[PDB]
Design an enzyme around this catalytic site. Structure first.
Site, PDB file in Angstrom:
ATOM      1  N   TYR A 273      32.526  22.288 -63.592  1.00 21.95           N
ATOM      2  CA  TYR A 273      32.494  20.837 -63.456  1.00 21.95           C
ATOM      3  C   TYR A 273      33.336  20.385 -62.273  1.00 21.95           C
ATOM      4  O   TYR A 273      34.262  21.078 -61.855  1.00 21.95           O
ATOM      5  CB  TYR A 273      33.008  20.169 -64.732  1.00 21.95           C
TER       6      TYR A 273
ATOM      7  N   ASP B   4      30.307  23.515 -77.683  1.00 14.89           N
ATOM      8  CA  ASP B   4      30.667  22.245 -77.056  1.00 14.89           C
ATOM      9  C   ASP B   4      31.401  21.264 -77.970  1.00 14.89           C
ATOM     10  O   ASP B   4      32.329  20.583 -77.534  1.00 14.89           O
ATOM     11  CB  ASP B   4      29.425  21.571 -76.470  1.00 14.89           C
TER      12      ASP B   4
ATOM     13  N   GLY C  57      15.885  16.538 -62.406  1.00 16.08           N
ATOM     14  CA  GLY C  57      16.355  16.190 -61.077  1.00 16.08           C
ATOM     15  C   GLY C  57      17.422  17.133 -60.555  1.00 16.08           C
ATOM     16  O   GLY C  57      18.481  17.261 -61.157  1.00 16.08           O
TER      17      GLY C  57
ATOM     18  N   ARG D 262      24.760  13.165 -63.496  1.00 16.58           N
ATOM     19  CA  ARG D 262      24.015  14.397 -63.710  1.00 16.58           C
ATOM     20  C   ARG D 262      22.688  14.118 -64.407  1.00 16.58           C
ATOM     21  O   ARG D 262      22.659  13.549 -65.497  1.00 16.58           O
ATOM     22  CB  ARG D 262      24.855  15.354 -64.555  1.00 16.58           C
TER      23      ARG D 262
ATOM     24  N   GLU E  57      24.008  11.488 -66.995  1.00 13.24           N
ATOM     25  CA  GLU E  57      25.035  12.100 -67.831  1.00 13.24           C
ATOM     26  C   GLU E  57      26.318  12.312 -67.044  1.00 13.24           C
ATOM     27  O   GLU E  57      26.283  12.503 -65.829  1.00 13.24           O
ATOM     28  CB  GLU E  57      24.560  13.448 -68.370  1.00 13.24           C
ATOM     29  N   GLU E  58      27.448  12.276 -67.746  1.00 15.18           N
ATOM     30  CA  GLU E  58      28.728  12.683 -67.175  1.00 15.18           C
ATOM     31  C   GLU E  58      28.988  12.072 -65.801  1.00 15.18           C
ATOM     32  O   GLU E  58      29.300  12.779 -64.843  1.00 15.18           O
ATOM     33  CB  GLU E  58      28.790  14.210 -67.097  1.00 15.18           C
TER      34      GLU E  58
ATOM     35  N   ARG F 277      27.121  28.655 -61.701  1.00 18.60           N
ATOM     36  CA  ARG F 277      28.311  27.850 -61.452  1.00 18.60           C
ATOM     37  C   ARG F 277      29.397  28.646 -60.736  1.00 18.60           C
ATOM     38  O   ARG F 277      30.457  28.917 -61.297  1.00 18.60           O
ATOM     39  CB  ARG F 277      28.838  27.259 -62.761  1.00 18.60           C
TER      40      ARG F 277
HETATM   41  C1  LIG Z   1      28.820  16.141 -75.571  1.00 20.46           C
HETATM   42  C2  LIG Z   1      28.603  17.535 -75.029  1.00 20.46           C
HETATM   43  O1  LIG Z   1      28.476  18.466 -75.704  1.00 20.46           O
HETATM   44  N1  LIG Z   1      28.462  17.581 -73.652  1.00 20.46           N
HETATM   45  C3  LIG Z   1      28.364  18.744 -72.858  1.00 20.46           C
HETATM   46  C4  LIG Z   1      27.149  18.853 -71.953  1.00 20.46           C
HETATM   47  C5  LIG Z   1      25.773  18.574 -72.505  1.00 20.46           C
HETATM   48  O2  LIG Z   1      25.416  19.608 -73.259  1.00 20.46           O
HETATM   49  C6  LIG Z   1      24.783  18.261 -71.371  1.00 20.46           C
HETATM   50  O3  LIG Z   1      25.227  17.424 -70.420  1.00 20.46           O
HETATM   51  C7  LIG Z   1      23.424  17.904 -71.901  1.00 20.46           C
HETATM   52  O4  LIG Z   1      23.356  16.757 -72.543  1.00 20.46           O
HETATM   53  O5  LIG Z   1      27.022  19.960 -71.074  1.00 20.46           O
HETATM   54  C8  LIG Z   1      28.057  20.903 -70.872  1.00 20.46           C
HETATM   55  C9  LIG Z   1      27.808  22.032 -69.904  1.00 20.46           C
HETATM   56  O6  LIG Z   1      28.903  22.787 -69.644  1.00 20.46           O
HETATM   57  O7  LIG Z   1      26.820  22.005 -69.236  1.00 20.46           O
HETATM   58  C10 LIG Z   1      29.459  20.677 -71.504  1.00 20.46           C
HETATM   59  C11 LIG Z   1      29.629  19.479 -72.446  1.00 20.46           C
HETATM   60  N2  LIG Z   1      30.608  19.681 -73.429  1.00 20.46           N
HETATM   61  C12 LIG Z   1      31.532  18.717 -73.915  1.00 20.46           C
HETATM   62  N3  LIG Z   1      31.445  17.543 -73.439  1.00 20.46           N
HETATM   63  N4  LIG Z   1      32.220  18.990 -74.987  1.00 20.46           N
HETATM   64 CA   LIG Z   2      19.462  18.866 -62.952  1.00 20.79          CA
END
Ligand SMILES: CC(=O)N[C@H]1[C@H]([C@H](O)[C@H](O)CO)OC(C(=O)O)=C[C@@H]1NC(=N)N
Ligand SMILES: [Ca+2]
Ligand SMILES: *[C@@H]1O[C@H](CO)[C@@H](O[C@@H]2O[C@H](CO)[C@@H](O[C@@H]3O[C@H](CO)[C@@H](O)[C@H](O)[C@@H]3O)[C@H](O)[C@H]2NC(C)=O)[C@H](O)[C@H]1NC(C)=O
Ligand SMILES: *[C@@H]1O[C@H](CO)[C@@H](O[C@@H]2O[C@H](CO)[C@@H](O[C@@H]3O[C@H](CO)[C@@H](O)[C@H](O)[C@@H]3O)[C@H](O)[C@H]2NC(C)=O)[C@H](O)[C@H]1NC(C)=O
Ligand SMILES: CC(=O)N[C@H]1[C@H]([C@H](O)[C@H](O)CO)OC(C(=O)O)=C[C@@H]1NC(=N)N
Ligand SMILES: CC(=O)N[C@H]1[C@H]([C@H](O)[C@H](O)CO)OC(C(=O)O)=C[C@@H]1NC(=N)N
Ligand SMILES: CC(=O)N[C@H]1[C@H]([C@H](O)[C@H](O)CO)OC(C(=O)O)=C[C@@H]1NC(=N)N
Ligand SMILES: *[C@@H]1O[C@H](CO)[C@@H](O)[C@H](O)[C@H]1NC(C)=O
Ligand SMILES: *[C@@H]1O[C@H](CO)[C@@H](O)[C@H](O)[C@H]1NC(C)=O
Ligand SMILES: *[C@@H]1O[C@H](CO)[C@@H](O)[C@H](O)[C@H]1NC(C)=O
Ligand SMILES: *[C@@H]1O[C@H](CO)[C@@H](O)[C@H](O)[C@H]1NC(C)=O
Ligand SMILES: *[C@@H]1O[C@H](CO)[C@@H](O)[C@H](O)[C@H]1NC(C)=O
Ligand SMILES: *[C@@H]1O[C@H](CO)[C@@H](O)[C@H](O)[C@H]1NC(C)=O
Ligand SMILES: [Ca+2]
Ligand SMILES: [Ca+2]
Ligand SMILES: [Ca+2]
Ligand SMILES: [Ca+2]
Ligand SMILES: [Ca+2]
Ligand SMILES: [Ca+2]
Ligand SMILES: [Ca+2]
Ligand SMILES: [Ca+2]
Lengths: 387, 387, 387, 387
Positions: D321, D70, D217, D212, D196-197, D287
């Site tokens: 996503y 990530d 949840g 998220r 999140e996100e 997914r």
């Molecule tokens: C900052 C970071 O690493 N964020 C994540 C994210 C994260 O691991 C979760 O939401 C849990 O906190 O999940 C995922 C995922 O595909 O589930 C991709 C993201 N990758 C990128 N944003 N680079």
């Molecule tokens: Ca969940």
């Protein structure tokens, strides 16, 4: 279009926020990316561009062979938007050159490109891509210039050039250039000094340059001057030595520090009164790692104490050339001139077993908000398929 | 937008400063670069561009096979910013053509592209990319034109075309073109002359062309005319012969020099009173090397003495076609028309062991400041992977 | 920006001058070029662009496999400057589509892109790249449109769509579109007619379309209408049959010619009173060769006599789809609407032993100056490395 | 240039018309396409662009190795025109980042790029490409943001950031940003919530975010606030659970649904009174697939009944996503804010046998005209040559 004033002071800064990273070498493993070195950043009132000296070849191709070599008829100065990889498909041609400088006066781009033989090199000056002047070697010994942006104040741009030995006393000249035309120059009276690859920036209507002593100084020489080219010279006094190679930090000198003083690397520093922001490698013997150090009295004081250190590239990672670039209020909307800097991350020869040498880049800009140290290395896996 | 005046004189020049180098063949080893030949440079009030005839194929691909061939339905005239490699990703399409010319009148681009069969070729004229006129072969024997920029004066642009034998008397016509429309033409009454691939430039409201005699002249023929197409003709008298092949320098002639007169290469020269700047290969027998020679009485004088020689490409390096291009005061801000020139560096067949033929380019502009001779060759390593 | 008037007549023309050639397949052997089919040209007041349906894949890559297939979720409408190869690096995205049309009203681009399942396809209309309307299949049988430019008059643009069998009576509708919004439509009452892939152009404030009868006509059906969509219908009467396949030339019919009437190819024709400029393949049984024929009474007369024939592509060379496009006076400065046309040169399956199918293009514009017939084929050597 | 008002309501929509598809992975098999993930779309008054987080590498190159990871110093935020493949040759550099957001206020682009170490990440804010502010991690545990467009209203732009555990209670802050400067922030008092996100959009001068919950949840949390950052919080009540993974549809909760509540995926929803447009995967465990569901009382009602379902990606195809983006009346000419959405189609690890992970994208916009469900999958054939 209006010419840059350049009459405000440097913005005080507490740290450095990352601004760009091009990942050039990683991408060049497959993509069509120029073999380059000596990159530098310079901005107009509208955009910031990465300038660079190509080797007239692409990464992972046989023509990248032997590109450790500094000068050839094939090297060209080109530029692309900051943060993009230097490719033949997104790069603007500037000049034929194995040494260069460039800057924007607020109206047009000035480029300086040096090519020709070692014993009679010629600097070609262009304003808006049109040849406006030339200056030929006066010591017949590798005429060479900044490898970073020139500095502009009220329609006049300034640069420094060197001609003569790389391992002894040479000759150093300052130039005042208006619309691509040299309107004045002066030779610096600097016995026992050595100036190469100056990083120059404007500050309160005057120019400050921090350069490289390849002769006998492990600290960095500086030269400052007004628009009339009335200059002062010296060396950074801090025991936090700025060149590479260098000795371990100790008591410094306001003159050239002889210890490990031969050879060196292009670098920069920002002066704030008696204080100085020093950018330097982390290694004392090789071009690896990079860090920014704030030394509140390092410009004029010889002790080795400092207040702030920020990591930029890890010590186990390759670095290389570094240089200053500024963003004028005409670009930022600020009431001061903002300091930024770039770092060249060199990969390949001589330290790595490849047929080629090339670099990528990262850049940072000074801010007064929260920042963090880290390592943003080149990241390429060598060797490549070509070797 | 304002049309070019073209009423000032040529800028006197003492030497030539390098302006561009694209390194096309070196880069094409890996990158996606067109196989090209017959490149040339032309400028607008805003930018300078490299025009070229593609072979409708890329370097190091099988479709580059047999590209020594001069004419085919696949060849197209395209252009890119000067100094950039000719790629499908940065090149603008101009016309379908195996012979061409182009120029900017200050308002829009005029392009001339000749395609079709050898016995009935048609030149298609475009103004701002819109077809505005055509002219069809009148001798049914390979209608052909400059392969360099046309010349513009006060809204009128001029070019020269040839139709007929390449080894004997042919037919030569001058055209006046306004907004892409042919408004006047005249056939030159030139018995015993041979004109091909003229390099034409404006000077004091009139046009001067230096061309190629492929029939029986080792010196170059010239034709000059005013806007009404009232012309004069002759050959460069200098004993410093300009064509290739040619004899060793000796006593020249104001008519066609028969010795080694057959065959030839596109070239150029700049007239200054009785004097002439001569660009020519260094070899008398092959297309290698390039040099610029100033001969103070070489236009009308037959001796082989000269005052200045500047090296451009070493004798052990391949050269090729060369041509003039000018920069108008509307572009430079000068009070005179600046002379520049380009050189095509041909690689491949027939002299090298490849399946393909292609060229790169370099260009220079005339200045009165210091310059230097050197060698800026193609630099590619043949053969390539495809062969 | 001003909307196109479209109220002048077609420029009379005596012949066709070549306008562009992209050499897409030749270049795609090495370069990154889209696999495409159904290309077409359309112009704004400023530029002409090549639109095309990608297969969401590049030439010489494994994803080009099976691209003989007409419809899929991966096909997209994209465009690039005319004469340039369709590459991911120079192409603008327009819409997701396996059937399409596009045109400029003088202010903005209108694009129509049809995607979705065979039994419920949806046409997405965009004006300046913004979705402005949709129209869904009304016969649930492959809703399909022009595959060439729509036609615009005084701010209204017009197109034709078909839904229903490809081998029997189907349903045909005309649409009037303003700023991307369907403001009117009408179903054509055309029993025993079959309309597909219409090539439509404006002429004296009205629209004329020449289309493809895939059901039972070896001549081409036409439909003309005014801005209120009051229409007339018929077939081109000439014994010089325009579709492919077709019978040898003989006595024609003003109704559908049943002989070899099944199947067909997209084509076009320009009407001049009782006369017609016919573009067609040279072969009666396959998509090879192309020629332009002037038949002074071919619109309404059934004989097989004609006055002018101009070669475009040799009979031994592959052709394919062809279509009209026009250049308005707002673009050319003329006092009439200039007719141009493009030809798709299809390579690969089913006639060639490759895994893929793709095409390049050539285009011509009508002139009254001298022209010449020739052959400007695709020129690619198949198969490719991928096969 | 005028700032977006953002004071109108969401356009009611009955269905979704496909807007773009880039086919990035298919094309990257041969072409030079970035390895990316976390793409998103955002529009200015002039154009829509695809933003994305590169891995500083290209598809089918060795540097794509391990890109399931990530965060790294090599990841950068870049953008290209919507529908085009993310390539080094057509992409604009935005920021160095492994988490990001971006949006246009009508005047300039705001970009937010987070980089640095997990225990002290720093978000760098840029306005028109100039650094304007920074915000550093306050919980020292992976500062992270939307991975989709921020929301702008009357010159102020808003985003949400998270810092803390991904598997437990974390900290969530809302920011108000004007010209790249943080002018206000507030920490959300949300015990037992996890955000999140967030996918945020403007509606009637206020901001609504659907996010998220990675903690516990399987339904999605939401937060809405006015320009003064006065907020409300909750979870989507519908029994049609929106996260992935999740339980089979049943009776929902207006609080976090614990069943299959751990883990998750970025998603979105559009609120219309008590009703909601829900975008979600088709699979409850992985997914894959994507569908749009209209649930007339799904915002506040807990039952699992719904009125409309539209297929977007088949259940046997990979998705990933998804996020909202809007088109303001300043862009469309409508009297309401149009809802659009994008879907990331993830290929590679961990589900597929490759060394790399990358995504392509599709996007749709809401309309009130006829639409159709289908499947527009990635379409790439794995594994690749590199693996
Ligand atoms: C900052 C970071 O690493 N964020 C994540 C994210 C994260 O691991 C979760 O939401 C849990 O906190 O999940 C995922 C995922 O595909 O589930 C991709 C993201 N990758 C990128 N944003 N680079
Ligand atoms: Ca969940
Ligand atoms: C570029 O073109 C040249 C010349 O056409 C190609 O070389 C030729 O390759 C062909 C096919 O392999 C050879 O043809 C064969 O000749 C043999 C006799 O030697 C005959 O028995 C076979 O029936 C066939 O005709 C040919 O020999 C060869 N010519 C030469 C001069 O080497 C070359 O392959 C092409 N290169 C590319 C990259 O396409
Ligand atoms: C991407 O990364 C993977 C994982 O690092 C690479 O696969 C690995 O390749 C290396 C080098 O060949 C292998 O290392 C060797 O392991 C053997 C024991 O099996 C050991 O004796 C050697 O000293 C060496 O360490 C490794 O086995 C292998 N790992 C796996 C899981 O296959 C892969 O090559 C990389 N791909 C690219 C395109 O760079
Ligand atoms: C003109 C030229 O060759 N300058 C040099 C430079 C030079 O050798 C020293 O400073 C000593 O004089 O150092 C190095 C270096 O990496 O140390 C790169 C340069 N290469 C290029 N600029 N091309
Ligand atoms: C129209 C055409 O084919 N012109 C020729 C040209 C010509 O053969 C001679 O001048 C004799 O007439 O010479 C040469 C040559 O390299 O000498 C290249 C040209 N190639 C292209 N223009 N494509
Ligand atoms: C919508 C669609 O599939 N249209 C067809 C088309 C069609 O099959 C016939 O006209 C009969 O109806 O013909 C052909 C063809 O090459 O004949 C190409 C098309 N392919 C694309 N437009 N994608
Ligand atoms: C700096 O230059 C600007 C532009 O000319 C001028 O308006 C201003 O007064 C100057 N500032 C100072 C402090 O002199
Ligand atoms: C690099 O140059 C050397 C000459 O010193 C040559 O021997 C070698 O083959 C070259 N390598 C490549 C890959 O071309
Ligand atoms: C050249 O043309 C310009 C523009 O028309 C005119 O003003 C000027 O007088 C001319 N120059 C000379 C030297 O005649
Ligand atoms: C065509 O339209 C133009 C633009 O409105 C108009 O000025 C002109 O009168 C029209 N021409 C004819 C012949 O009606
Ligand atoms: C093309 O598709 C077929 C499936 O019908 C498959 O068998 C073949 O392997 C594919 N070819 C390539 C080169 O992927
Ligand atoms: C929205 O903002 C615009 C621009 O300020 C304003 O003119 C208008 O009154 C507002 N619309 C509504 C419905 O309040
Ligand atoms: Ca490639
Ligand atoms: Ca030193
Ligand atoms: Ca100190
Ligand atoms: Ca000769
Ligand atoms: Ca002489
Ligand atoms: Ca038929
Ligand atoms: Ca007839
Ligand atoms: Ca419900």
């Amino acid at each position: 279009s209006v010419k840059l004033a350049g009459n405000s002071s440097l913005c005080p800064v507490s740290g450095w926020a990352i601004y760009s990273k091009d990942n050039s070498v990683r991408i060049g493993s497959k993509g069509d990316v120029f073999v380059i070195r000596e990159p530098f950043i310079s901005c107009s009132p509208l955009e910031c561009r990465t300038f660079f000296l190509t080797q007239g070849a692409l990464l992972n191709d046989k023509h990248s062979n032997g590109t450790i070599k500094d000068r050839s008829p094939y090297r060209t100065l080109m530029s692309c938007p900051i943060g993009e990889v230097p490719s033949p498909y997104n790069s603007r041609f500037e000049s034929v050159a194995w040494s260069a400088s460039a800057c924007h006066d607020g109206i047009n781009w000035l480029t300086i490109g040096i090519s020709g033989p070692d014993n009679g090199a010629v600097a070609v000056l262009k304003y808006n891509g049109i040849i406006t002047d030339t200056i030929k070697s006066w010591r017949n010994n590798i005429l060479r210039t900044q490898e970073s942006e020139c500095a502009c104040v009220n329609g006049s741009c300034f640069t420094v050039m060197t001609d003569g030995p790389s391992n002894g006393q040479a000759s150093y000249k300052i130039f005042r250039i208006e619309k691509g035309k040299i309107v004045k120059s002066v030779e610096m009276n600097a016995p026992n000094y050595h100036y190469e690859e100056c990083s120059c920036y404007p500050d309160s209507s005057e120019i400050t340059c921090v350069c490289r002593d390849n002769w006998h100084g492990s600290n960095r020489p500086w030269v400052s001057f007004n628009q009339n080219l009335e200059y002062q010279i010296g060396y950074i006094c801090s025991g936090i030595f700025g060149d590479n190679p260098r000795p371990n930090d100790k008591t410094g000198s306001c003159g050239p520090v002889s210890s490990n003083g031969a050879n060196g690397v292009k670098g920069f520093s920002f002066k704030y009164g008696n204080g100085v922001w020093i950018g330097r490698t982390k290694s004392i013997s090789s071009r690896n790692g990079f860090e920014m150090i704030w030394d509140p009295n390092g410009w004029t004081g010889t002790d080795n104490n400092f207040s702030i250190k920020q990591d930029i590239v890890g010590i186990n990672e390759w670095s290389g050339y570094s240089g200053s670039f500024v963003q004028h209020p005409e670009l930022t909307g600020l009431d001061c001139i903002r300091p930024c800097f770039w770092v060249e991350l060199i990969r390949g020869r001589p330290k790595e077993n490849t047929i080629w040498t090339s670099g990528s880049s990262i850049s940072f800009c000074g801010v007064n908000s929260d920042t963090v140290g880290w390592s943003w290395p080149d990241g390429a896996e060598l060797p490549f398929t070509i070797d």
